[PDB]
Nucleic acid binder design. Structure first.
Length: 63
DNA sequence: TTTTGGCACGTTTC
DNA sequence: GAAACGTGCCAAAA
């Protein structure tokens, strides 16, 4: 929690668009991996961020 | 089924 | 007086 100007912003799209665009993550799953490396942001925040950056859900982009 | 939006609180500083 | 940041549950939407 209590991150910078975008320590979870400039990261949610920089890993998800690099892994498996044919098998996307979710606001829970991205919130989880971000706790393993230094962000420890919850799903409530990360949801509001993939909204503001530019992602509709990535499920709807993939399917 | 899965993924996600609206409402409210904690914190600190102005 | 108020903002800003992440964050707790609820139900809504595909």
């Amino acid at each position: 929690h209590m991150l910078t100007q975008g320590e979870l912003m400039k990261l949610i799209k920089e890993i998800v668009e690099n892994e498996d665009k044919r098998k996307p993550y979710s606001d829970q799953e991205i919130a989880n991996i971000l706790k393993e490396k230094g962000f420890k942001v919850a799903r409530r925040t990360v949801a509001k961020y993939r909204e503001m950056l530019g992602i509709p859900s990535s499920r709807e982009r993939r399917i």
